[PDB]
Amino acid sequence: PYAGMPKEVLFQFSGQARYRIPREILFWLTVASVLVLIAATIAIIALSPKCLDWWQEGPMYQIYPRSFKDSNKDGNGDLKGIQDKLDYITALNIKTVWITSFYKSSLKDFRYGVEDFREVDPIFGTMEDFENLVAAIHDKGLKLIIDFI
Amino acid sequence: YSTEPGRYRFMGTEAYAESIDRTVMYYGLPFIQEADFPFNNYLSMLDTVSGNSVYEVITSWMENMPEGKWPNWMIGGPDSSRLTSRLGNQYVNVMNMLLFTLPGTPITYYGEEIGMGNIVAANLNESYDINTLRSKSPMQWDNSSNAGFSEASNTWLPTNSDYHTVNVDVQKTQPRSALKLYQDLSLLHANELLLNRGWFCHLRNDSHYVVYTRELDGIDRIFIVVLNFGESTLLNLHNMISGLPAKMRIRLSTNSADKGSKVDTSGIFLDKGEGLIFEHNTKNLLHRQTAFRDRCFVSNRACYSSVLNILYTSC
Amino acid sequence: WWGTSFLLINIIGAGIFVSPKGVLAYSCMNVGVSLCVWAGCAILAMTSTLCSAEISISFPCSGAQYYFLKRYFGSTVAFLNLWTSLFLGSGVVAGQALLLAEYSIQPFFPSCSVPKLPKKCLALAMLWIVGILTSRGVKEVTWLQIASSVLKVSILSFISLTGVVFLIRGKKENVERFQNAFDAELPDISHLIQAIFQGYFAYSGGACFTLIAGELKKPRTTIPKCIFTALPLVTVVYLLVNISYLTVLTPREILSSDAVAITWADRAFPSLAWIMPFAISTSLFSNLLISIFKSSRPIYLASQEGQLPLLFNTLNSHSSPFTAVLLLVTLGSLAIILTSLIDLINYIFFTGSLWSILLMIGILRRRYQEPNLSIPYKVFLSFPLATIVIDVGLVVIPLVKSPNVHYVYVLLLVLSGLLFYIPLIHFKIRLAWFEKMTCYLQLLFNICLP
Ligand SMILES: *[C@@H]1O[C@H](CO)[C@@H](O[C@@H]2O[C@H](CO)[C@@H](O)[C@H](O)[C@H]2NC(C)=O)[C@H](O)[C@H]1NC(C)=O
Ligand SMILES: *[C@@H]1O[C@H](CO)[C@@H](O[C@@H]2O[C@H](CO)[C@@H](O)[C@H](O)[C@H]2NC(C)=O)[C@H](O)[C@H]1NC(C)=O
Ligand SMILES: *[C@@H]1O[C@H](CO)[C@@H](O[C@@H]2O[C@H](CO)[C@@H](O)[C@H](O)[C@H]2NC(C)=O)[C@H](O)[C@H]1NC(C)=O
């Protein structure tokens, strides 16, 4: 078994059990360890609780659209003003933004009298403003829910 | 539209002038999905505060709810008088704490973090309910013109006359403002498993104070929340809870000047509208004891392994 | 010709599946910055590939780059290169194992973060099974590798076509992000360097055909032309892949998500039916096998000369190297356990650029006193001079920024290279117990030197 030992002297001590069985033992131990790792992984993936949903982990913020922020010098709040203040909402560690009714309406109190369910009231902006606000909210990792009558 | 992962769609219902048994029916059935949760506004219906009333509200909601469901809480809304005018200024801070320690999802009405009050009723040309216009004043941002809400000569509603000293801008510098406490409570709720999850165990009712605990299996730490809703008084935690040290460290308090201070367990002195959150290291969780299995609730039960630093269901 | 086809099939690699997040992880969600970052990475890889082709046509194999170092530097430099390339290969195989296990394990968790423990366990299991498959058995499977290449090119083509179609349709929600770009805040230079590292890993990943380029038959005739015809194609493919990902996903979810392709398919076509994770996992497993074989080859190739571990030059079992495979498995397991994936890439290609610096100065040594004796080139090696400064800029500022001490530890290991080299060679000390251990291990595993 000297340095650089060739093939012929290899068949001189491998026959001995002390050099015959440990190789097989190590091979089967390694494959057993591989199976143990697979079993541990498949056990940990199961038996694990389902994680909380987005509406279960973070607080919600309720906003009255007409009294949050004006952005066109008209006296009424609008969606653009809401978009312009998303940094303040983020600084509050808020997860969900809740906006009350803003559809095109003829009566804005005593519940709501809606004149069109697929339009935004002109005093709040246009549909393009709503789409921009939704995109801005989704970019910052927030989520939006709206009222329905 | 809720099949794509990460895009679940929420839906809740509003029923206000109703009883608790008819309200909890919107939660659905174990084999029928009806709603995620009905909005809870029982707290916002209180015109006066005491330990007994808050205890009754919390216990009623937590007992009538189906087991395993997700609760929620509100303290104000567009159809209710603002909190600092309904109950007074002294209760502004403590209620916020109550909102951020109960199990479930908290809901905040705009302007509650600053602490706005109602405005004197005024008549408008448009048709509106004069009895509810008091809670729809514009947001107060800074001490400029119309409180920074608009740059126009006239707003659709008058702004509150105290905006010169109560606005977002001034409170971002003051270290004792309600905004700082709200931000601290929100951060603590977002960065602690014990608050966004885990058991909620409440002790016996009292006329002055409300005391409860939050805990989880395998954390070895508990949060003890104590709130004083009556008058200034003295409290001895040894009688209510056994196995506590003589001195305890306040993790958070409504009076921000006492953060990190040490108090004596027997003889805690509380002022009108005060709140303390103690963090305690122990291993005797209440929900495992025999006396308290009837006063602890969870949703999505889980256990934490620190050695593996994971969560598992079988406990 | 099919030569460029084989070249691109080798080049495409497997990093394209992981980099889009990391590059977007740095630069703070700036799309234009990321596009410029991969543009610069592609140019840098162009230059490095050209220099590597020069060395390959001037020198046969990896041992021939070792001999090149011997010609133009001392033996210490070449030995340091050898042992550093050992760590490079170990880190590469560890990263591939992490990526494979992580992609396989993601689908079970629908919309949350996968815990680190199952990911590490599965990565260790995959690395161990690949290591035990390489030795005592299979060296290469042609059918599986052909199928994996076909699947990978099909997936890439499908993603590119879908992105092109969605961009052409002109919907506002799909194109508005491309317009009004660059409004995000400008990051620091360290984030630029990290993004460059990730992009270079993406694009140069699998572009290690230096040995492959060494067996070509048209020196200075088609190899530069082959590179000029192949590399910009995969550059455009990668850029348009970014186009598609940013078209149908937001930067926030791309950064928060772990498997970019899986979430891309989830949002685009909610009918994948677990086909995409399985296909990508099979492709990554094939790439792992190919990479472990290609990394085991140079160790045995250079083990026959100038190596203290004479035990390494021992073909055994079914004519397979054993010591090199075991050492690679051990180092890969340590890399899996002790650290994450992105920082592994950062350290790996920081070391890669650090050694490319010395490769470039050796090429300049071919021109240091004899500029005329350089290899024939289109612009007479003007570009490598600039790439030297580029690499210097890459290596300098991570030290002054110093956000992680592991950067210092890399240089500490490099210096320990010479620290170990000095007593072995200069003093020529031999250990009897070393011989005893070698003989015992030879008798244990039937280890013999042919
Ligand atoms: C709208 O409200 C205003 C004031 O509440 C009413 O009167 C306006 O203002 C002064 C007196 O307040 C009048 O001299 C103006 O002529 C009024 N302006 C306008 C534009 O009418 C006003 O009558 C109300 N209008 C309606 C339709 O109810
Ligand atoms: C209104 O808010 C401003 C903003 O801080 C207060 O401070 C004034 O404005 C700048 C900012 O410090 C200073 O240069 C002025 O000197 C401040 N005014 C005074 C009187 O000190 C300001 O005090 C607030 N109140 C009023 C009435 O302006
Ligand atoms: C805690 O429990 C109840 C509160 O509902 C109180 O006991 C009742 O007090 C009211 C007041 O007259 C009456 O209903 C009875 O006299 C009591 N018993 C029952 C069964 O109702 C008790 O006092 C409360 N503890 C306090 C306030 O410290």
Q: Which two tokens stand for residue B196?
A: 């966004």
Q: Look at C118 and A44 and tell me if their CB atoms are within 8 Å.
A: yes
Are C300 and C312 in contact by the 8 Å Cβ rule? The answer is yes
d(CA B221, CA B315): 17
Helices (H) and strands (E) in chain A, counts: 6, 5
State whether residue C252 sits within 8 Å of chain B by CB. no
Inter-CA distances, B146 with B173, C117, C125, Å? 21, 56, 66
Are C128 and A37 in contact by the 8 Å Cβ rule? The answer is yes
Residue with tokens 């629908």: C110
- Cα dihedral across residues C344, C350, C353, C359: positive or negative: negative
Are C156 and C11 in contact by the 8 Å Cβ rule? The answer is no
d(CA B107, CA C215): 69
Q: Look at B300 and A52 and tell me if their CB atoms are within 8 Å.
A: yes
State whether residue A57 sits within 8 Å of chain B by CB. yes
d(CA C363, CA C357): 10
State whether residue B4 sits within 8 Å of chain C by CB. yes
Residues 84-143 of A with CB under 8 A from C: 131, 135, 138-141
Strand partners of residue B279:
B223
d(CA C87, CA C351): 10
SS3 B263: strand
Q: Which two tokens stand for residue C340?
A: 């994450």
Q: What is the dihedral of CA C259, C262, C268, C274, to 10 degrees?
A: -170
Inter-CA distances, C366 with A50, C47, C81, C351, Å? 62, 17, 19, 23
* CA C205 to chain CA centroid, nearest Å: 4
Inter-CA distances, B130 with B83, B111, B112, B120, B135, Å? 18, 20, 21, 10, 10
Residue C381: left (phi > 0), alpha (psi -120 to 50), or beta? left
d(CA B81, CA B129): 13
For helices C75-105 and C116-134, the axis angle rounded to 10 degrees is 120
Q: Which two tokens stand for residue C124?
A: 């260790």
Strand partners of residue A145:
A98
Chain B, chain C: beta-carbon pairs less than 8 Å apart: 17
- Best residue in C267, C319, C443, C445 to probe A by mutation, most A CBs within 10 Å? C443
User: Which residue's CA is minimally distant from atom 1 of ligand 3?
Assistant: B205
SS3 B280: strand
Backbone angles phi, psi at C134, to 5 degrees: -65, -55
Is residue C194 exposed (0-12), middle (13-18) or buried (19+ Cβ within 10 Å)? buried
d(CA B6, CA B208): 44
Q: Which helix (H) or strand (E) holds A77?
A: none
Instruction: Give B176's contacts (C-beta < 8 A, 6+ positions apart).
Output: B256, B257
- Burial of B260-298, coded b for 16+ CB within 10 Å and e otherwise, reads eeebebeebebeebbbbbbebeeeebbbeeeebeebbbb
CA C78–ligand 1 middle distance (angstroms): 92
**Other beta carbons within 10 Å of C315:** 14
Q: Which two tokens stand for residue C78?
A: 């070449």
**Other beta carbons within 10 Å of C334:** 12
Are C254 and C32 in contact by the 8 Å Cβ rule? The answer is no
Residues with CB under 6 A from ligand 3: B 52, 205-207
Give the determination technique. Answer: cryo-EM
Q: Look at C443 and A1 and tell me if their CB atoms are within 8 Å.
A: yes
Strand partners of residue B221:
B281
d(CA C30, CA A53): 29
Instruction: Give C169's contacts (C-beta < 8 A, 6+ positions apart).
Output: none
Backbone angles phi, psi at A147, to 5 degrees: -80, 155
Q: Are strands A96-99 and A143-146 parallel, antiparallel or unpaired?
A: parallel
Resolution (Å units): 2.6
Closest by CA to C120, choosing from C108, C102, C104, C133, is C102
- What ranges make up the beta strands (E) of chain B? 72-74, 105-109, 199-202, 209-215, 221-228, 233-236, 247-253, 262-264, 266-270, 274-281, 296-297, 303-305, 310-312
CA B214–ligand 3 middle distance (angstroms): 26
CA B52–ligand 3 middle distance (angstroms): 9
Backbone angles phi, psi at B74, to 5 degrees: -135, 150
- Pocket test of ligand 3: the residue of B53, B54, B202, B205 to mutate, having most ligand atoms within 8 Å of its CB, is B205
Instruction: Give C83's contacts (C-beta < 8 A, 6+ positions apart).
Output: C417
Closest by CA to A30, choosing from C91, C318, C131, is C131
State whether residue A84 sits within 8 Å of chain B by CB. no
Q: Which two tokens stand for residue B288?
A: 């495992």
Instruction: Give B57's contacts (C-beta < 8 A, 6+ positions apart).
Output: B42, B43, B46
State whether residue A108 sits within 8 Å of chain B by CB. yes
SS3 A114: strand
Residue with tokens 């677990």: C274
Backbone angles phi, psi at B302, to 5 degrees: -155, 160
d(CA C19, CA C30): 15
- Cα dihedral across residues A111, A113, A114, A120: positive or negative: negative
Q: Which two tokens stand for residue A27?
A: 């091979």
Q: Which two tokens stand for residue C242?
A: 């970014």
Strand partners of residue B280:
B222
